[PDB]
């Protein structure tokens, strides 16, 4: 009967207790996003990829939810393969970063996606 690790099972929310998605599984996700009408975007964190609270500890205040946007939302993108080119360019620039693909639903005025696209070495 097993123990689940107290060390090193840092998670990046949706889809992260699954095996890492192959570019095929990542592509199908980016293609879902797109088949619902949602604009994909990439966030990349170089500096600690986990929430924390340094600035203030109030109810529902956390530091670290916001990453830097990698370029803009791919408004009117129809081909998910356009998108994977970006995960892959970002990753050149930032072998450092954790990249995540988020999506915007402008119908509901809200972000609807966030899956970790690239865990930096040994994450």
């Amino acid at each position: 009967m097993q123990v689940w690790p107290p060390i090193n099972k840092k998670k990046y929310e949706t889809l992260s207790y699954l095996p890492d998605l192959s570019q095929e599984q990542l592509l199908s996700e980016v293609e879902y996003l797109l088949k619902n009408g949602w604009v994909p975007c990439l966030e990349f964190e170089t500096e600690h990829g986990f929430v924390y609270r340094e600035n203030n500890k109030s109810p529902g205040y956390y530091d670290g939810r916001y990453w830097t946007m990698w370029k803009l939302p791919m408004f009117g993108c129809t081909d998910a393969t356009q998108v994977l080119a970006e995960v892959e360019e970002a990753k050149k620039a930032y072998p450092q970063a954790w990249i995540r693909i988020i999506g915007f639903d402008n119908v509901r005025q809200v972000q609807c996606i966030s899956f970790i696209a690239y865990k930096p070495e040994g994450y």
Binding site: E13, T14, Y62, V110
Partner: protein, 441 residues
Amino acid sequence: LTYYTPEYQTKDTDILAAFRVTPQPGVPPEEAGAAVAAESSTVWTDGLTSLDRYKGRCYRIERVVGEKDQYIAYVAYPLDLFEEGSVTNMFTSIVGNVFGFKALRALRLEDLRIPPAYVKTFQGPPHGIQVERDKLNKYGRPLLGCTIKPKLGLSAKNYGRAVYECLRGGLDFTKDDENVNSQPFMRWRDRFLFCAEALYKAEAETGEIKGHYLNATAGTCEEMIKRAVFARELGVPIVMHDYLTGGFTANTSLAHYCRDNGLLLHIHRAMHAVIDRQKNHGIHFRVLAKALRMSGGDHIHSGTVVGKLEGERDITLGFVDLLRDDFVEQDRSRGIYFTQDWVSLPGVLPVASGGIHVWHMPALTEIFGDDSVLQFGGGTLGHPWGNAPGAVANRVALEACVKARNEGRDLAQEGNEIIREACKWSPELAAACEVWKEIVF
């Protein structure tokens, strides 16, 4: 029969109720519906106002064919009757005197059309679905919860450890049972301190925001706010209130305290089946949750579905929408007897609860979709390898259900199978599929 008005044209500032009346034999249906409306007024001084402005109009009576001979009488209540922003008042004025009229065998309130001009007098959810996900930074799945068990039974450090094992295993939320307030074995303020400790640890372990629905329910308004105030002192994200035993007056006060302080509110509907279970008498849960979307809560328990099946799953799907959506138009097969325009009142997240463990995952995921909380007691706690293995086990099960849906698979048919695939690559989940299959296939 001056309250039965076939010719009334409704106003858009009218509370409309749809009462299933089962008259006493011999009450003409007309006289039955007019009787329901007439519990609005009676005369003398009446000549010093025009009672014509403060009366319920039973404008339409329909026949509930075949469910017996019952009738859906439609009463229309003027806006001026209600105190702006008071669910305690809207329930006193409607469900306050009618259900005990001699000329009625059993009457039931099925729905309410709360006009937008009344909607606007309410704060609503202190947050609601969207801000809640923004706050919590969780997108793409239903969120997961663990209910600590036993409810009454353990100490505070024990409740508190259960909490952590569970939350480090990847569930997002843990719940104080509805019966847990402050009690000889576990007094509130220590449950709060240890559940606070436990959730910050679990969150520093995962890297994901975790939180515990601390039950702020108490016996006076003052003590409820006292407990709420101490959650705020810890910086914890969510508190809890059972809104039917505590009250609508009180609920509304916890809900304005949380708006102003940034805490989320998990509302538990304990006691509701006392009012909403019987088909011929009571008030139907969809009314009891329109009352909560207005009084205020961020999560509301909507029960489970995969147990209580299709056809009745349609009225569950009717009030999840009434909860979550900005406008739920008229659909008398899902039990929406009236269109409802929520005029930008935040939605409440459905918490599905009870009977659940993993072959439920795809179905639940499908009935409810993304905007829900799947709350497991035994689905997690009753795992072979304990609490964190159970957490991981409902979680990878859910994420398998997300990925499958996302790569266009049909959870409705591939479900059981999808979970079959997932057992295979997860140790933790596999041992859950076993005890699953101690009653599964």
